[PDB]
């Protein structure tokens, strides 16, 4: 908690441009003017991550009522390669776990991953997420097209 070089910040119209710029380098799929418009309204659920006051990461979430459940869906969460394995991703995930924990009303949290994403599985599994489904050809135009669905229970 103390002496850490990593801080999260609110996303705002003033810095959204840079969120967009980070999601483009980190993630293989491109997001539309709707995704970003939407994040400006989700509050604590969209955060930029800084390492020594430099924006190197970001996470974007959404609330989901699917399957007759109250669900936290993680849409993006990542950080530029050179800054990985410094605990930045942990900062972003925990932040989100905390929101859920205080709110008390979530059944579970979840997200999709290209099955080739070995590091994201090591990462999310550390936190207690399990692979609960494997959808075939989930993504449209990237390779590979298959995706695991990851999920941690809260209730």
């Amino acid at each position: 908690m103390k002496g850490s070089r990593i801080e999260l910040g609110d996303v705002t119209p003033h810095n959204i441009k840079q969120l967009k710029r980070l999601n483009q380098v980190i993630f293989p799929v491109s997001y539309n003017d709707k995704f970003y418009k939407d994040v400006l309204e989700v509050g604590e659920l969209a955060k930029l991550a800084y390492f020594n006051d430099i924006a190197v990461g970001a996470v974007c979430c959404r609330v989901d009522h699917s399957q007759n459940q109250k669900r936290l869906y993680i849409m993006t969460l990542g950080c530029l390669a050179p800054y990985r394995r410094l605990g930045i991703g942990t900062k972003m995930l925990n932040h989100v776990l905390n929101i859920c924990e205080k709110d008390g009303t979530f059944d579970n949290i979840y997200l999709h991953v290209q099955i080739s994403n070995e590091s994201a599985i090591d990462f999310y599994r550390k936190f207690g997420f399990e692979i609960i489904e494997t959808k075939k050809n989930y993504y449209k135009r990237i390779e590979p097209a298959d995706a695991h669905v990851l999920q941690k229970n809260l209730k």
Binding site: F27, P28, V29, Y31, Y73, M75, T76, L111, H112, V113, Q114, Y139, K140
Partner: peptide, 4 residues
Amino acid sequence: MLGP
């Protein structure tokens, strides 16, 4: 990573 959604999409979509």
